[PDB]
């Protein structure tokens, strides 16, 4: 029942999100981490411009060096805010994943492979998000949505 | 614990010890007395009484008739356009939890876990340094979760 399901997008991927990220909306991203990956990111953006760079309401950034981590942040007017670093990370080079981002009224709730991973409080209203960016060293098998509208 | 106060005498005026950066939460728990006419939560630029400090965000439940919430901004001792919410969760002799979420372009307010209203910034939130609570209300606690922490 997912909506706007696409497969194997070319990376970097920048796509217009097909409906509003109302509370209850899911973004479902399946993929895998390449063996030489250093990092990738999933960015929920207000616009697609590269100059001035579009605000990033939610930057979800797995990093694989050393024991690995996930960094989350927001870009406002081309400046990053406070990093929220999650050291309990489910991602691994060579492991496939399913990311589910649930939009709540006050935060995002992210699960990976059916298990809760992290929360991230809103800094930009989620109604301003209209673009999904996926960048870095990653293969994305599929993207789909479950809209709450 | 430096960012919470319990059972403040009303009127309460306190300096906010960090910036209301996007992502910051203000959580106010309390109870409305049986004879209340109104109370207000004011996010202020300073604490001056003469001349009266600007109020970036005046959040003002009123109990007469069917009740409402009035929101407004005071700049140089002049009130702007009132934003009136008729769907109000406040009642005499009822408890509440207010959550004010500071976003890039607005405040988002939820009471008792239910969305209540939005209020677009009219004064930059970086100018807010003081919280006031006035009127007929009992406050159990005020807490801040700063997005810089
Ligand atoms: C690496 C690096 C440097 O920059 C990253 C940010 O990444 C920017 C970014 N956007 C991209 C889009 C596409 C691609 C691509 O490969 O196509 C690569 C991209 N990179 C690296 C971000 O992760 C950001 C998250 O906080 O962290 C740093 S900046 C930074 C540093 C310290 C602090 Cl304390 C704070 Cl707050 C912030
Ligand atoms: C009642 C009353 C009159 O004034 C309020 C404002 O409240 C001022 C105020 N500040 C206080 C601080 C402390 C205490 C206390 O009891 O300790 C009481 C306070 N009061 C009443 C405001 O609610 C303001 C919000 O718009 O509305 C009115 S003015 C007004 C009238 C019409 C229009 Cl159309 C427009 Cl735009 C504006
Ligand atoms: Cl916003």
Numbering used by the authors:
A (entry chain B): 7 to 155
B (entry chain A): 8 to 156
Please quote the authors directly.
Galectin-8 is a tandem-repeat galectin consisting of two distinct carbohydrate recognition domains and is a potential drug target. Like other galectin CRDs, Gal-8N is ~130 amino acid β-sandwich that contains a galectin-defining amino acid motif coordinating conserved binding of galactose via hydrogen bonds to OH 4 and 6, and ring oxygen, and hydrophobic interaction with H 3, 4 and 512. Furthermore, ligands generally bind to the N-terminal domain (Gal-8N) with substantially higher affinity than to the C-terminal domain (Gal-8C). Since the expression of the Gal-8 gene LGALS8 is much more amplified in a variety of tumours compared with Gal-1 and Gal-3, possibly its most important function remains its role in cancer, particularly in angiogenesis and lymphangiogenesis, and inhibiting these processes by a Gal-8 inhibitor seems a plausible therapeutic option.
The alkynyl moiety of the 2-O-propargyl moiety leans directly towards the Arg45 guanidinium group with a distance between the terminal propargyl carbon atom and the terminal Arg45 nitrogen atom of 3.2 Å and 3.4 Å in the two independent copies. However, an even more important answer that could explain the increase in binding enthalpy comes from the structural analysis of 11 in complex with Gal-8N, where a contact between the 2-O-propargyl moiety and a guanidine moiety of Arg45 is observed. This contact is similar to, but not the same as a contact we observed between d-galactal ethylene and the guanidine of Arg45 and may be rationalized by non-canonical cation-π interactions. Alkyne-cation interactions have been reported several times in synthetic chemistry, but to our knowledge no such interactions have been found between a ligand and a protein, which is why we have labelled them “non-canonical cation-π interactions”. These were studied with quantum mechanical calculations which indicate that the LUMO of Arg45 of Gal-8N (depicted in blue) points towards the HOMO electrons of propargyl alkyne (depicted in red) of compound 11, but without evident HOMO-LUMO overlap, meaning that the covalent nature of this interaction is negligible. Yet, the distance between the guanidine C-atom and the terminal C-atom of the alkyne is 3.3 Å, which is in line with a distance threshold for classical cation-π interactions, as these occur within a distance of 6 Å31. The observed interaction is unique and may account for the enthalpy-driven increase in the affinity of 11 for Gal-8N. Surprisingly, the comparison of thermodynamic parameters between 11 and 1 shows an unexpected gain in enthalpic contribution with a further loss in binding entropy compared to 29 (11 vs 1: ΔΔH = –17 kJ mol−1, TΔΔS = +14 kJ mol−1, 11 vs 29: ΔΔH = –4 kJ mol−1, TΔΔS = +6 kJ mol−1), suggesting that contributions other than classical hydrophobic interactions govern the binding of 11.
